[PDB]
Design a protein around this motif. Structure first.
Motif, PDB file in Angstrom:
ATOM      1  N   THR A  33      -0.122  15.567  -8.787  1.00 24.97           N
ATOM      2  CA  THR A  33      -1.564  15.621  -8.997  1.00 24.97           C
ATOM      3  C   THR A  33      -1.940  15.894 -10.446  1.00 24.97           C
ATOM      4  N   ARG A  58      -8.432   7.536  -7.605  1.00 25.98           N
ATOM      5  CA  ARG A  58      -9.853   7.276  -7.442  1.00 25.98           C
ATOM      6  C   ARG A  58     -10.092   5.814  -7.114  1.00 25.98           C
ATOM      7  N   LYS A 102     -18.866   8.257   4.525  1.00 22.98           N
ATOM      8  CA  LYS A 102     -17.868   8.196   3.468  1.00 22.98           C
ATOM      9  C   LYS A 102     -18.338   7.326   2.314  1.00 22.98           C
ATOM     10  N   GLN A 159     -18.844   8.427  -1.609  1.00 19.45           N
ATOM     11  CA  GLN A 159     -18.248   7.724  -2.738  1.00 19.45           C
ATOM     12  C   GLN A 159     -19.293   7.395  -3.793  1.00 19.45           C
ATOM     13  N   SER A 199     -10.461  13.806   0.304  1.00 24.38           N
ATOM     14  CA  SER A 199     -10.299  13.297   1.658  1.00 24.38           C
ATOM     15  C   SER A 199      -8.879  13.551   2.144  1.00 24.38           C
ATOM     16  N   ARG A 238       0.830  -1.199   0.000  1.00 24.39           N
ATOM     17  CA  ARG A 238       0.000   0.000   0.000  1.00 24.39           C
ATOM     18  C   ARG A 238       0.866   1.251   0.000  1.00 24.39           C
ATOM     19  N   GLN A 269       1.034   4.219  -2.582  1.00 27.12           N
ATOM     20  CA  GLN A 269       0.691   5.612  -2.328  1.00 27.12           C
ATOM     21  C   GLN A 269       1.885   6.514  -2.586  1.00 27.12           C
ATOM     22  N   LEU A 288     -10.463   1.254  -0.785  1.00 31.42           N
ATOM     23  CA  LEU A 288     -10.122   1.330   0.631  1.00 31.42           C
ATOM     24  C   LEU A 288     -11.360   1.470   1.506  1.00 31.42           C
ATOM     25  N   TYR A 289     -12.363   2.208   1.048  1.00 31.07           N
ATOM     26  CA  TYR A 289     -13.478   2.552   1.922  1.00 31.07           C
ATOM     27  C   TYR A 289     -14.812   2.126   1.342  1.00 31.07           C
ATOM     28  N   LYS A 314      -5.401  21.861  -3.875  1.00 23.81           N
ATOM     29  CA  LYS A 314      -4.880  20.789  -4.706  1.00 23.81           C
ATOM     30  C   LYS A 314      -5.812  20.434  -5.860  1.00 23.81           C
ATOM     31  N   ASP A 336     -14.745  15.782   2.306  1.00 23.48           N
ATOM     32  CA  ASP A 336     -14.660  14.913   3.481  1.00 23.48           C
ATOM     33  C   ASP A 336     -13.725  15.537   4.520  1.00 23.48           C
ATOM     34  N   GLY A 356     -17.285  13.198 -10.213  1.00 21.68           N
ATOM     35  CA  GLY A 356     -16.447  14.243  -9.676  1.00 21.68           C
ATOM     36  C   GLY A 356     -15.224  13.667  -8.979  1.00 21.68           C
ATOM     37  N   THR A 357     -14.807  14.355  -7.919  1.00 25.34           N
ATOM     38  CA  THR A 357     -13.666  13.939  -7.116  1.00 25.34           C
ATOM     39  C   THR A 357     -13.976  14.064  -5.632  1.00 25.34           C
ATOM     40  N   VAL A 358     -13.644  13.022  -4.876  1.00 26.40           N
ATOM     41  CA  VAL A 358     -13.754  13.065  -3.424  1.00 26.40           C
ATOM     42  C   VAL A 358     -12.438  13.597  -2.874  1.00 26.40           C
ATOM     43  N   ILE A 412      -6.207  10.350   2.715  1.00 17.57           N
ATOM     44  CA  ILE A 412      -5.420   9.906   1.576  1.00 17.57           C
ATOM     45  C   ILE A 412      -4.381  10.933   1.164  1.00 17.57           C
ATOM     46  N   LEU A 429      -8.170   3.675  -5.812  1.00 18.22           N
ATOM     47  CA  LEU A 429      -7.689   3.348  -4.478  1.00 18.22           C
ATOM     48  C   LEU A 429      -8.741   3.674  -3.433  1.00 18.22           C
ATOM     49  N   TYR A 430      -9.330   4.870  -3.517  1.00 23.42           N
ATOM     50  CA  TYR A 430     -10.338   5.243  -2.533  1.00 23.42           C
ATOM     51  C   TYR A 430     -11.491   4.256  -2.563  1.00 23.42           C
ATOM     52  N   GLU A 455     -11.019  20.082 -13.468  1.00 25.08           N
ATOM     53  CA  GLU A 455     -11.420  18.747 -13.894  1.00 25.08           C
ATOM     54  C   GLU A 455     -12.044  17.956 -12.754  1.00 25.08           C
ATOM     55  N   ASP A 456     -11.599  18.193 -11.521  1.00 29.69           N
ATOM     56  CA  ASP A 456     -11.987  17.339 -10.405  1.00 29.69           C
ATOM     57  C   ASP A 456     -13.452  17.492 -10.012  1.00 29.69           C
TER      58      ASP A 456
END
Lengths: 88, 524
Positions: free
Chosen positions: A71, A81, B285, B289, B301, A59, A63, A87-88, B310, B223, B297-299, B304, A83-84, B314-315
């Protein structure tokens, strides 16, 4: 990018495909020569089986590689994406 | 600042006066023969109306104590309307009817707590009866008839509602919006709905419904917990270009950022609304998701390793339309691909199969139903816009009525159901004398609405009430034609839910106000 060290690690991984730490080492070496698609694919394949693979090193490495790619990298973004979602 | 206090009888008389003024103002508009009320405005001609809600919103008196009384009954009464969709006037009338009798009894020397207990007992027995007397309404033809009746005799709206509800199912979500001209359409798209309200007022841009609506906006997932607007500047500027609104779903926004966003959206520049995520725990959470997958879109958190500076353009997420009520949120037609949705469904399906407890299994069943279900859209056109807007309003009303009806069933309305129930309970007794008095008070107050409806049509109340008690079943009185008969065949009926809600809420507030002792307020 087809270095001898990567070649021997590839042969060793082919011999022991279940070894997560060996694949993690090979993925790190693949990433260090810019072969990030293969490295992330390998690491994610191991993570999909077990999130704690290589006692959590798989992991971490994963990461870390993503953090190294920045980014603005499309390949990393995707994996991030995924990975998230894993993971959850 | 100095205060002023009043004890006992001196307080009760004032509170009674306040409630009397509110009731007298509201209760003339009851029934199908209602009178008119004239409301003044600062600019231009006055307004003439026949609606209970608009009159009730305005009243506030001069003297402090009486105003407190009026406000107190008003707040309780409003909730029934918010919960079921009708019946504010009925609740107000019932509250007045109980309070008057109760205070007269108390002044004669009986204990208050006994009266309270009696009234609650009688109300519970009455609700039992009211469930017993009802009749079901489940099949499609009955749905169509109920919708037609509720919409003032137009078959078109009724049959449209029925066919759509068959299309999506009884649990689905139905939404109505404008069309392209004199042909009706209905379709299915990808959508979402959940229970979170707006974080603050002043986001309203359409005062008629007290709701916020945005078209093709941007969506941001958070988040984390945000209280400083500093880290929001880059995304806010990136959204400032291209002229598109913005929606923020997070866990909470406090203080500085909240006020700043309020001011910015209230001075025009930029369009933003924000709400909390659904639920809590790790499931919060998980739902974030799921919404992300839907909108693409983009989460963001922290765990991570993200931060707010950041993110790029696009996100963010982008979708067709969003609607925010006071306590419900709806998302219509985003961008997601079928493949991602199907994989999401597969994963959650197997996690259901993997479950080890009924609790988690049922929660996951909820989640798969919500995701892989759908939404339906209705487009109405009417050729000369004025008719179009009028029809749209009528369709919305019919939709609410039909939903409430299919929930729990219908019963003979126009005020006869309550009098029938109260006639079936002549036997009820309690523990001592005072509880008996309380029971009698509640039963004799249950008759107010029909007596008023008859009083507006210029008749003699007691005779009609006596005759209606005399019979059995649904045999009742029709105000629009002066005839007796089967109330179910003449097409007068109401959902059960509204009657039950009105009864319970009025009983609650009257119970609280019977047993107060002191009042504390400001000095003139």
């Amino acid at each position: 990018a087809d270095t001898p060290e990567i070649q021997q690690l590839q042969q060793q991984v082919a011999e022991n495909p279940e070894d997560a730490a060996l694949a993690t080492q090979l993925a790190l070496q693949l990433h260090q020569v810019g072969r990030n698609e293969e490295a992330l694919e390998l690491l994610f394949g191991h993570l999909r089986k077990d999130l704690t693979a290589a006692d959590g090193q798989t992991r971490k490495t994963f990461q870390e590689i993503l953090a190294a790619l920045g980014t603005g990298d499309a390949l990393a973004s995707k994996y991030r994406r995924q990975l998230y979602a894993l993971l959850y | 600042a100095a205060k002023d206090v009043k004890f006992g009888n001196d307080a009760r008389v004032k509170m009674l006066r306040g409630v009397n003024v509110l009731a007298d103002a509201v209760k003339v508009t009851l029934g199908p023969k209602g009178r008119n009320v004239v409301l003044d405005k600062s600019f231009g001609a006055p307004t003439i109306t026949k609606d209970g809600v608009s009159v009730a919103r305005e009243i506030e008196l001069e003297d402090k104590f009486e105003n407190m009384g009026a406000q107190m009954v008003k707040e309780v009464a409003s909730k029934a309307n918010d919960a079921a969709g009708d019946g504010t006037t009925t609740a107000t009338v019932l509250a007045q009817a109980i309070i008057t009798e109760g205070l007269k009894a108390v002044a004669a020397g009986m204990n208050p707590m006994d009266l309270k207990r009696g009234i609650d007992k009688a109300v519970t027995a009455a609700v039992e009866e009211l469930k017993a007397l009802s009749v079901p309404c489940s099949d499609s033809k009955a749905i169509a008839q109920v919708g037609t009746i509720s919409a003032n005799s137009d078959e078109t709206v009724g049959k449209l509602i029925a066919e759509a509800m068959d299309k999506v199912g009884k649990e689905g979500v139905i939404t109505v919006e404008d069309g392209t001209g004199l042909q009706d359409e209905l379709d299915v798209v990808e959508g979402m709905q959940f229970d979170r309200g707006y974080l603050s007022p002043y986001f309203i841009n359409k005062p008629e419904t007290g709701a916020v609506e945005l078209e093709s906006p941007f969506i941001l997932l958070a988040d984390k917990k945000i209280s400083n607007i500093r880290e929001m500047l880059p995304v806010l500027e990136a959204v400032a270009k291209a002229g598109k609104p913005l929606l923020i779903i997070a866990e909470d926004v406090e203080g500085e950022a909240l006020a700043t966003l309020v001011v910015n959206t209230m001075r025009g520049i930029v369009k933003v609304a924000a709400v909390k995520a659904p639920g809590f725990g790790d499931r919060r959470k998980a739902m974030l998701q799921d919404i992300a997958t839907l909108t693409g879109g983009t989460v963001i958190s922290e765990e991570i390793g993200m931060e707010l500076e950041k993110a790029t353009l696009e996100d963010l997420g982008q979708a067709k339309r969003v609607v925010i009520n006071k306590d419900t949120t709806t998302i219509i037609d985003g961008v997601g691909e079928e493949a991602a949705i199907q994989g999401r469904v597969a994963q959650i399906r197997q996690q259901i199969e993997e479950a080890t407890s009924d609790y988690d299994r049922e929660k996951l069943q909820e989640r798969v139903a919500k995701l892989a279900g759908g939404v339906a859209v209705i487009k109405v056109g009417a050729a000369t816009e004025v008719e179009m807007k009028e029809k749209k309003a009528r369709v919305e009303d019919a939709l609410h009525a039909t939903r409430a009806a299919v929930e729990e069933g219908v019963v003979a309305g126009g005020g006869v159901a309550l009098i029938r129930v109260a006639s079936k309970l002549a036997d009820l007794r309690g523990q001592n004398e005072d509880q008996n008095v309380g029971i009698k008070v509640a039963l004799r107050a249950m008759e107010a609405p029909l007596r008023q409806i008859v009083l507006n049509c210029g008749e003699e109340p007691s005779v009609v009430a006596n005759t209606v008690k005399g019979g059995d079943g649904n045999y009742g009185y029709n105000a629009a034609t002066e005839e007796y008969g089967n109330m179910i065949d003449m097409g007068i009926l109401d959902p059960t839910k509204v009657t039950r809600s009105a009864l319970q809420y009025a009983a609650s507030v009257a119970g609280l106000m019977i047993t107060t002792e002191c009042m504390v307020t400001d000095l003139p």
